């Protein structure tokens, strides 16, 4: 089984005990660490933070402590948008420029592979032609990684992709059966199912549908998303189930209606550390004074509220339920967004360091590597 964990290169700017920096990485917590994010300049892979080269050295230096750890660099992300991806895949020459730059870049900084986080081909402004061009880009990278392994005699660079769970995004940009053959593994973003872009409360990452749901809404859950990618042609062993160590927050229309599906007026108040309206880290909801925790019986996940603030999140119990689920399905493992949103320092939840990700590790019965 795999435990794929995302590091974010902006967590270093959080204040106080929420600041995430080199020393906070555990070299044996996960099997694969993915560095978010790289960017693109003139169709070539490039850094996005002033000290990325310093962090790369720290990041990939973990492999000196755990030689079996694999590291990947993720390009893209939500805020990156789509225009640079669209321009790069528009021509064979631009794709070749990108592919060659990626191989040199990964080898130079000692990454073991590349994680494609284009969000998304065919959506977020990207034209419909990008669906097939994304298939071609995945093929170009896979084939070029294979060729580089042969000419260099080194171990082949890995290729993964972070993929959406909602059907409108999948059908707009993903030839699932084709790309699954060329990807080493598929990181299913089984979160952001609901959020403050909607006018009623809903859970970030529900495992199952609610009984009252219908239509397209009844597919906005983990089980439906997994079945979607499996039925569309992803081998179970390549499908890695994403897990959130954060929640999605709402400002309720009235403190007297705290139901799942209650009217919301907008995003929840920004957290004291993450400072991003609409989301909260696990350590910002696990010891929230005065709040009331609840569980969604149909969906097997908690929510919590205080006054006009409503947050759906994941706890140790829901992570355990989700792992038991993935095991029943025969999936390749779990993926986590993100290291810095768990209680990585153990300063808030009184559950030790990395309580959520240690739960995944234990439930997946991953080997204790020295
Ligand atoms: C990776 C993850 N997710 C986003 O980065 C993100 C994902 C969506 C989204 O799926 N999504 C789906 C459907 C419709 C809109 C929408 N918008 C999104 N916004 C923008 C956004 C807008 C309004 C309120 C909150 C967030 C986002 N930043 C994340 C990153 C950092 C910290 C926690 C979690």
- Is 271 within a domain? no
Experimental method: X-ray
User: Is residue 279 in contact with ligand 1, taking CB distance under 6 Å?
Assistant: yes
User: Is residue 242 in contact with ligand 1, taking CB distance under 6 Å?
Assistant: no
- Is 155 within a domain? yes
Q: Of 119, 213, 284, 363, which is the active-site residue? A: 119
- Supply φ then ψ for residue 213, to 5 degrees: -75, 155
- Is 369 within a domain? no
Give the domain CATH number at 229.
Answer: 3.20.20.80
- Is 308 within a domain? no
Ligand 1 atom nearest to CA at 196: 24
- At 273 the three-state DSSP class reads coil
Q: Which H, E and C letters describe 194-263, residue by residue?
A: CCCCCCECCCCCCCCCCCCCCHHHHHCCHHHHHHHHHHCCCCHHHEEEEEECEEEEEEECCCCCCCCCCE
User: Is residue 124 in contact with ligand 1, taking CB distance under 6 Å?
Assistant: no
**Dist CA 6 CA 135 (whole Å):** 24
Q: Are 174 and 131 in contact (CB under 8 A)?
A: yes
- Is 109 within a domain? yes
The secondary structure element, H or E, covering residue 5 is strand 2-8
Residue 197 CA, ligand 1 centroid: distance in Å: 9
User: Is residue 196 in contact with ligand 1, taking CB distance under 6 Å?
Assistant: yes
78 is in an annotated binding site: yes
What range does the domain containing 223 cover?
2-244+314-363
Q: Give the number of other CB atoms < 10 A from CB of residue 181.
A: 13
Ligand 1 atom nearest to CA at 267: 24
- Is 269 within a domain? no
Ligand 1 atom nearest to CA at 78: 5
- Is 305 within a domain? no
79 is in an annotated binding site: yes
- Is 62 within a domain? yes
284 among known catalytic residues? no
CA dihedral 306→309→310→316, nearest 10 degrees, is -60
Q: What is the resolution of this structure in A?
A: 1.8
The secondary structure element, H or E, covering residue 301 is strand 301-306
Tally of domains within the chain? 1
**Dist CA 244 CA 313 (whole Å):** 8
């Amino acid at each position: 089984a795999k435990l794929v964990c995302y590091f974010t290169n902006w967590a270093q700017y959080r204040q106080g005990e929420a600041r995430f920096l080199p020393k906070d990485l555990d070299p044996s917590l996960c099997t694969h660490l993915i560095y978010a994010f790289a960017g693109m300049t003139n169709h070539q892979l490039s850094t996005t933070e002033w000290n990325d080269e310093t962090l790369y050295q720290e990041f990939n230096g973990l492999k000196k402590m755990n030689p079996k750890l694999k590291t990947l660099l993720a390009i893209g992300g939500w805020n990156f948008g789509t225009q640079k991806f669209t321009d790069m895949v528009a021509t064979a020459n631009n794709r070749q420029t990108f592919v060659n730059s990626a191989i040199r870049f990964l080898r130079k900084y000692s990454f073991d592979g590349l994680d494609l986080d284009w969000e998304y081909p065919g959506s977020q402004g990207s034209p419909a032609v990008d669906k097939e061009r994304f298939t071609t880009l995945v093929q170009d990278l896979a084939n070029a990684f294979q060729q580089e392994a042969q000419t260099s005699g080194k171990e082949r660079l890995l290729l993964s992709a972070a993929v959406p769970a909602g059907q409108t995004y999948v059908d707009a940009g993903y030839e699932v059966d084709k790309i699954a053959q060329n990807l080493d593994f598929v990181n299913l973003m089984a979160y952001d199912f609901h959020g403050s872009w909607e006018k009623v409360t809903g859970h970030n990452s529900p495992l199952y549908k609610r009984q009252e749901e219908s239509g397209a809404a009844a597919s906005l859950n983990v089980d439906a998303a997994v079945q979607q990618w499996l039925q569309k042609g992803t081998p179970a062993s390549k499908l890695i189930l994403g897990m959130p160590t954060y929640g999605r927050s709402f400002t309720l229309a009235s403190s007297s209606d705290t139901r799942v599906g209650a009217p919301a007026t907008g995003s929840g108040t920004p957290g004291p550390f993450t400072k991003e309206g609409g989301m909260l880290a696990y350590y910002e909801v696990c010891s929230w004074k005065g709040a009331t925790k609840q569980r969604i019986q149909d969906q097997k996940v908690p929510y919590i509220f205080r006054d006009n603030q409503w947050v759906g999140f994941d706890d140790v119990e829901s992570f355990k339920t989700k792992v038991s689920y993935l095991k029943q399905k025969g999936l390749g493992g779990a993926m986590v967004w993100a290291l810095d949103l768990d209680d990585f320092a153990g300063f808030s939840c009184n559950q030790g360091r990395y309580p959520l990700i240690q739960t995944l590790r234990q439930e997946l019965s991953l080997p204790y590597l020295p």
